[PDB]
Amino acid sequence: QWAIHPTFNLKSLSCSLEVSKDSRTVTVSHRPQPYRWSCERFSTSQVLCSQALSKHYWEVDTRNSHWAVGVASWEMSRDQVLGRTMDSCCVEWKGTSQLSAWHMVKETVLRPGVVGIWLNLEEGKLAFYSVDEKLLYECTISASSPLYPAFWLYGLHPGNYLIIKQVKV
Amino acid sequence: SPFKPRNYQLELALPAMKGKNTIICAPTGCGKTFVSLLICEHHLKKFPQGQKGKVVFFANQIPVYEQQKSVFSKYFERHGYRVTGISGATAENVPVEQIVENNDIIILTPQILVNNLKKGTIPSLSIFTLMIFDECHNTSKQHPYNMIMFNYLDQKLGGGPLPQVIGLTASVGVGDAKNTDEALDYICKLCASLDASVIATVKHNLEELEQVVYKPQKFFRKVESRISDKFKYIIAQLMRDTESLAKRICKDLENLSQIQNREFGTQKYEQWIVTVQKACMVFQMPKDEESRICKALFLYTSHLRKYNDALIISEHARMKDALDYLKDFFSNVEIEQDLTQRFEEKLQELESVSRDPSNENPKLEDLCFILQEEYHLNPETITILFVKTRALVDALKNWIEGNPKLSFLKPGILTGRGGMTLPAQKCILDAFKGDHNILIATSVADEGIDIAQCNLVILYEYVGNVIKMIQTRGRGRARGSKCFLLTSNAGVIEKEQINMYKEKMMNDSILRLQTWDEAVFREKILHIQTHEKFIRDSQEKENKKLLCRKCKALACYTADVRVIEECHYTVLGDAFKECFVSRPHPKPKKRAKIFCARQNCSHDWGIHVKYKTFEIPVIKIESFVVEDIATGVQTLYSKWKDFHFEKIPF
Ligand SMILES: Nc1ncnc2c1ncn2[C@@H]1O[C@H](COP(=O)(O)OP(=O)(O)O)[C@@H](O)[C@H]1O
Ligand code: ALF
Ligand SMILES: [Mg+2]
Ligand SMILES: [Zn+2]
């Protein structure tokens, strides 16, 4: 019930990464996509969900290479790397074939899978899940500024796409 | 000691162990150096008591020389054999005639051996018994390896004992074949050039090779250019203006050079400018107006060339660098006042567009992206970046150190001597074993640097023949490595693809050659050697005036020039002591430079220097035009070898 039906935003898209017309699919293009030059542009292969979040649940699949999914504020630096700055907290499947959760400077590492995020700002709790279901690392983080899901995709493996999966109650 | 010999090393060693002159062809990283170690050890230990033999090992580039010397020294210390090396580094070197005799293993750079052989201090090659040629694919038209082999073969075919020859390679090279037949011909000619009967490639223990050696993966990155470039447009407008200015004075110069449809940022334009120069400063008139026209055209063409260089650097390097170069030229250095006004007019617009980051060079943008995403994926990795020119090495060093986004990178420069020195190269190399993470290298990083950890190779518009492709790709000794060719031209990508094929076709041709029956191979090799030796043997068998290239002032005459130490040129006489003027505080200060006497002509002729006791000025032929004392003809000499005269000592 608490789950929302999110969608990507087309203002923070990376020139290397492409989005489908339905805006339910992201993927890595073979060639760069020329786009507007702006201070918003990441200049790096991650994107943000369109919906702002100021009791919401949304889940993505990791089927089809190297990915990071988490939460980030708007006040984050555009050129900064996802998951290592103050405003961001994420889980990434690193190149050592391991899954980890990244905090301000730290990295707690622990078999990948289809993941889900459930947040409650009133209780200020963040929970990550694996559907098989299963549980991932849970934290107690509440942000003053409203947040967005932040997704980083591997930028050099063409044919690697990410879809947020829309389950129903 | 801890190194355990693997099977394929013994397989490769076998034919050399038997005692035939052989070539070894193995993929990069398999450890051919250890194979050389084993062959040398077995060959040296074979001799009976009271008799001993020598071993010689070459290398082209200095860092490779240093690392091979270190490897040999560490391995052969325990047996007690004495090793040593010679290079350009050793100063006041003990005469080699016996440093060859004193030691067992000697490491060199082939130019030293060629020098000694030509001078004759070393009598003959028979003093040695085993010659090892690393990176043996370079034995070709005039490379020093081939001259050593020329001495070897000229000795053998005519009438003492001769040493065994071993060569190592990772790619024998395909030359310019268009079909398997020509590749086979090229490989046969190569084998003939160094007198080898056997080519050794690992086949029995192949499967062992696949999990021992990881093949690096290849990728391409095409980057488009910007449709609208403010700096390009404004500099092109300056080009059009300066071209109109130059056109107006001269009666004609469209017709002087056959070149047509000259673009602005192309090397063809640079060749056109050079041709116009070399055709105009040689043009004669029946007199001061002649000098004035020469000066005007000289200045116009010089600024044209400098701006064209700025354009090409701008399209290659970052925005700021081109303006830096142009401003330095203008500040360091009538009509020139006019051109200075023209440039200072636009200076501020140029700076404004330079400091607008939206118009950044896209190649640098994509390179930042590649480094960022890789270092995000793997926090720790060692990467190498390949460029064409040292100026770009400095530019990339500064640009990498000045980007807040790339705080990860810790840079390390590497280039050939002359300029980094030998111990500096050794320290930079050893550091990578440490706090450095990226290495910016010129062409010297080919033919084996052997960094135990490298997972990323980047080519910045760097392409060539198949040998360079293979040797560049092979650097990624670490498993999971990758190579990325970054370019803004499709033809480069096409050349890379066709080179990959050429590698495949060569690799098939060598396997075809391996099937041939023995003693027919050797027969055709002997035939080729005989024919080539015959071909080479029969192949071979005043007081003029010099004047300033910019103001046509009578500089001197060749009857007053005396060469010192056969290698410096100077002139004595008070007449020359008036024709020039030094500068009070010379730009290096590190010694006073020479300049044209007339304030109209500020042209640098030469430089002061002191022989053992005497301070004298020396000039460069690059400063004058030569004119006959009898006729009015002129030519231009770019290099003293072409000039012919009565060379007289001090
Ligand atoms: N017995 C061994 N076990 C493991 N590594 C070895 C062994 N012998 C040599 N090597 C490795 O081989 C490398 C030398 O390879 P090299 O012959 O220079 O490559 P290439 O064939 O491209 O010239 C060294 O870095 C060394 O670590
Ligand atoms: F001989 Al190599 F890398 F090809 F050392
Ligand atoms: Mg080698
Ligand atoms: Zn002059």
Given A31, A43, A81, which is nearest B369 (Cβ)? A43
Contacts of B609 (CB under 8 A, 6+ apart): B568, B591, B615, B616, B617, B618
Give the residue carrying structure tokens 């000289």: B298
B290 three-class SS: helix
Q: Which ligand is nearest to the CA of B170?
A: 2
Domain end point (choices B360, B384, B410): B360
Q: Which atom of ligand 1 is nearest to the CA of B4?
A: 1
Contacts of B564 (CB under 8 A, 6+ apart): B570, B611, B649, B650
**A74 found inside a domain:** yes
* Cα B457 versus chain centre, distance: 20
User: Buried b / exposed e across B6-44, counting CB within 10 Å, b at 16+?
Assistant: bebbebbbebbeeeebbbbbbbbbbbbbbbbbbbbbebb
Instruction: State the Cα–Cα distance between residues A127 and A89, nearest whole angstrom.
Output: 11
Stretch 382-421 of chain B: residues touching chain A, C-beta under 8 Å: 404-405
DSSP, res B434:
-
Residues B150, B167 contacting (CB under 8 angstroms): no
Å from B487 to nearest chain A CA?
13
B203 and B71 share one domain: yes
Structure-solving method = cryo-EM
Provide the H-helix boundaries in B419-489.
422-431, 466-473
Give strand pairing partners of A25: A163
Angle between helices B288-316 and B319-332 (to 10 degrees): 160
The two beta strands, A17-19 and A25-28, are antiparallel
B23 and B154 share one domain: yes
Stretch 299-358 of chain B: residues touching chain A, C-beta under 8 Å: 358
Instruction: State the Cα–Cα distance between residues B253 and B259, nearest whole angstrom.
Output: 11
Q: For a substitution probing ligand 1, which of B450, B470, B471, B472 has the most ligand atoms within 8 Å of its CB?
A: B450
DSSP, res B436:
-
Instruction: State the Cα–Cα distance between residues B374 and B480, nearest whole angstrom.
Output: 12
B129 and B241 share one domain: no
Which residues does a 6 A CB cutoff place in the pocket of ligand 1?
B 3-4, 6, 26, 28-34, 170, 448, 450, 452, 474
Does the CA dihedral B473-B475-B476-B482 come out positive or negative? negative
> Is the Cβ of B366 closer than 8 Å to some Cβ of chain A?
yes
Residue B136 known to bind ligand: no
B611 three-class SS: coil
Among protein residues, the one with the nearest Cα to ligand 2's atom 2 is B448
Instruction: State the Cα–Cα distance between residues B50 and B233, nearest whole angstrom.
Output: 79
Among protein residues, the one with the nearest Cα to ligand 2's atom 5 is B448
φ, ψ for residue B539, nearest 5 deg: -65, -45
Residue among B188, B138, B172, B194 at smallest CA distance from B20? B194
Q: Please report the DSSP string for B7-53 in residue order.
A: HHHHHHHHHHHHT--EEEE--TTS-HHHHHHHHHHHHHHTSPTT---
Question: Which residues on chain A are in Cβ contact (under 8 Å) with B404?
Answer: 79
Task: Please report, for the domain that includes residue A148, its CATH number.
Answer: 2.60.120.920
Å from A154 to nearest chain B CA?
8
Taking CA atoms, B363 is separated from B157, B317, B399, B488, in Å, by 55, 9, 13, 8
Residues B23, B169 contacting (CB under 8 angstroms): yes
Taking CA atoms, B328 is separated from B298, B301, B323, B325, B550, in Å, by 19, 18, 8, 5, 21
The token pair at B205 is: 């223990």
Residues A15, A41 contacting (CB under 8 angstroms): yes
Residues B474, B28 contacting (CB under 8 angstroms): yes
The residue in chain A having the minimum alpha-carbon distance to the alpha carbon of residue B366 is A43
Domain end point (choices B313, B339, B360): B360
- Supply the range of the domain harboring residue B560: 542-650
Taking CA atoms, A112 is separated from A134, B226, B587, in Å, by 11, 41, 65
CA dihedral B133, B139, B144, B149 (to 10 degrees): 80
Give the residue carrying structure tokens 């009015």: B632
A113: exposed, middle or buried (Cβ count in 10 Å: 0-12, 13-18, 19+): middle
Q: Which atom of ligand 2 is nearest to the CA of B135?
A: 1
Instruction: State the Cα–Cα distance between residues B268 and B256, nearest whole angstrom.
Output: 15
B453 and B578 share one domain: no
Taking CA atoms, B300 is separated from B83, B251, B343, B416, B647, in Å, by 59, 15, 13, 35, 36
The two beta strands, B594-596 and B580-582, are antiparallel
Instruction: State the Cα–Cα distance between residues B444 and B65, nearest whole angstrom.
Output: 12
CA atoms within 13 A on the CB side of B30: 26
Instruction: State the Cα–Cα distance between residues B520 and B188, nearest whole angstrom.
Output: 12
Provide the H-helix boundaries in B515-603.
521-539, 574-579
Residues B166, B24 contacting (CB under 8 angstroms): yes
CA atoms within 13 A on the CB side of B189: 19
> Is the Cβ of B368 closer than 8 Å to some Cβ of chain A?
yes
Give strand pairing partners of B167: B23, B133
Instruction: State the Cα–Cα distance between residues B238 and B245, nearest whole angstrom.
Output: 10
Q: Which atom of ligand 2 is nearest to the CA of B475?
A: 3
Q: Which ligand is nearest to the CA of B35?
A: 1
Please state the length of chain A: 169
The two beta strands, B438-441 and B411-414, are parallel
B340 and B385 share one domain: no
Taking CA atoms, B198 is separated from B23, B138, B513, B571, in Å, by 6, 18, 10, 59
Taking CA atoms, A30 is separated from A26, A47, A151, B388, B621, in Å, by 13, 18, 19, 27, 54
> Is the Cβ of B479 closer than 8 Å to some Cβ of chain A?
no
CA atoms within 13 A on the CB side of B176: 0
Residues B476, B457 contacting (CB under 8 angstroms): yes
B426: exposed, middle or buried (Cβ count in 10 Å: 0-12, 13-18, 19+): middle
Residue among B68, B62, B60 at smallest CA distance from B32? B68
Q: Which ligand is nearest to the CA of B27?
A: 1
Residues B466, B174 contacting (CB under 8 angstroms): yes
B499 and B579 share one domain: no
Question: Which residues on chain A are in Cβ contact (under 8 Å) with B405?
Answer: 79
Does the CA dihedral B576-B580-B584-B586 come out positive or negative? negative
Give the residue carrying structure tokens 């889900």: A116
B5 three-class SS: coil
With residues binned 3-state (H G I as helix, E B as strand, rest as coil), the percentages for chain A, rounded to 5, are 0, 45, 55
CB within 8 Å: B373 and A156 = yes
The C-alpha R_g of chain A, in whole angstroms, comes to 15
B313 three-class SS: helix
Resolution in units of Å: 4.2
Provide the residue type at B523 as one letter. E
Instruction: State the Cα–Cα distance between residues A131 and A115, nearest whole angstrom.
Output: 6
B295 and B222 share one domain: no
CB within 8 Å: B365 and A16 = no
**A11 found inside a domain:** no
B590: exposed, middle or buried (Cβ count in 10 Å: 0-12, 13-18, 19+): exposed
CA atoms within 13 A on the CB side of B497: 6
B311 and B277 share one domain: yes
* Cα B406 versus chain centre, distance: 30
B130 and B246 share one domain: no
With residues binned 3-state (H G I as helix, E B as strand, rest as coil), the percentages for chain B, rounded to 5, are 45, 15, 40
Question: Which residues on chain B are in Cβ contact (under 8 Å) with A94?
Answer: 377
Provide the residue type at B354 as one letter. S
Q: Which ligand is nearest to the CA of B169?
A: 2
Å from A17 to nearest chain B CA?
12
Residues B312, B236 contacting (CB under 8 angstroms): no
B123 and B235 share one domain: no
> Is the Cβ of B237 closer than 8 Å to some Cβ of chain A?
no
**A137 found inside a domain:** yes
Instruction: State the Cα–Cα distance between residues B489 and B495, nearest whole angstrom.
Output: 10
Instruction: State the Cα–Cα distance between residues B164 and B177, nearest whole angstrom.
Output: 30
Q: For a substitution probing ligand 2, which of B9, B12, B32, B384 has the most ligand atoms within 8 Å of its CB?
A: B32
Taking CA atoms, B634 is separated from B50, B278, B545, B550, in Å, by 68, 11, 10, 14
B643 three-class SS: coil
| Count of domains for chain A | 1
Q: For a substitution probing ligand 1, which of B6, B12, B24, B33 has the most ligand atoms within 8 Å of its CB?
A: B33
Q: Please report the DSSP string for B318-383 in residue order.
A: -HHHHHHHHHHHHHH--HHHHHHHHHHHHHHHHHHHHT-GGG--HHHHHHHHHHHHHHHH-SS--E
CB within 8 Å: A45 and B373 = yes
Instruction: State the Cα–Cα distance between residues A122 and B500, nearest whole angstrom.
Output: 60
A/B interface, count of CB pairs below 8 Å: 31
Which residues does a 6 A CB cutoff place in the pocket of ligand 2?
B 28, 32, 170, 448, 450, 471, 474
Which residues are found with C-beta within 5 Å of the ion, ligand 3?
Answer: B 448
The token pair at B379 is: 């926090």
CB within 8 Å: A44 and B222 = no
B507 and B536 share one domain: no
Instruction: State the Cα–Cα distance between residues B45 and B55, nearest whole angstrom.
Output: 12
CB within 8 Å: A44 and B224 = no
CA of B601 to the centre of ligand 4 (A): 4
**Could you count the other beta carbons within 10 Å of the beta carbon of residue B223?**
17
Å from A24 to nearest chain B CA?
24
Number of helices (H), then strands (E), belonging to chain A: the values are 0, 13
φ, ψ for residue B594, nearest 5 deg: -105, 150
The token pair at B301 is: 């063409």
B238 and B150 share one domain: no
- Supply the range of the domain harboring residue A142: 17-165
CA dihedral B34, B38, B44, B47 (to 10 degrees): -170
| Count of domains for chain B | 4
Starting at the earlier edge strand, list the strands of the sheet with B217-222: B217-222, B482-487, B456-460, B383-386, B438-441, B411-414
**A42 found inside a domain:** yes
Residues A99, A129 contacting (CB under 8 angstroms): no
Residue B31 known to bind ligand: yes
Instruction: State the Cα–Cα distance between residues B112 and B118, nearest whole angstrom.
Output: 10
**Could you count the other beta carbons within 10 Å of the beta carbon of residue B498?**
11
Residue B596 known to bind ligand: yes
For the stretch B77-82, contacts whose Cβ atoms lie closer than 8 Å and that sit 24 or more positions apart, written own/partner, are B78/B1, B79/B41, B81/B44, B81/B105
Instruction: State the Cα–Cα distance between residues A45 and A12, nearest whole angstrom.
Output: 10
Give strand pairing partners of A59: A116, A165
In the 3-class helix/strand/coil scheme, how is B195-250 assigned residue by residue? Answer: CCCEEECCCCCHHHHHHHCCCCEEEEEECCCCCCCHHHHHHHHHHHHHHHHHHHHC
Give strand pairing partners of B39: none
In the 3-class helix/strand/coil scheme, how is A42-102 assigned residue by residue? Answer: CCCCEEEECCCECCEEEEECCCCCCEEEEEEECCCCCCCCCCCCCCCEEEEEECCCEEEEE
**Could you count the other beta carbons within 10 Å of the beta carbon of residue B267?**
10
Instruction: State the Cα–Cα distance between residues B34 and B31, nearest whole angstrom.
Output: 6
Instruction: State the Cα–Cα distance between residues B391 and A67, nearest whole angstrom.
Output: 38
Å from B384 to nearest chain A CA?
18
The residue in chain B having the minimum alpha-carbon distance to the alpha carbon of residue A32 is B223
The residue in chain B having the minimum alpha-carbon distance to the alpha carbon of residue A78 is B405
Q: Which atom of ligand 1 is nearest to the CA of B28?
A: 22
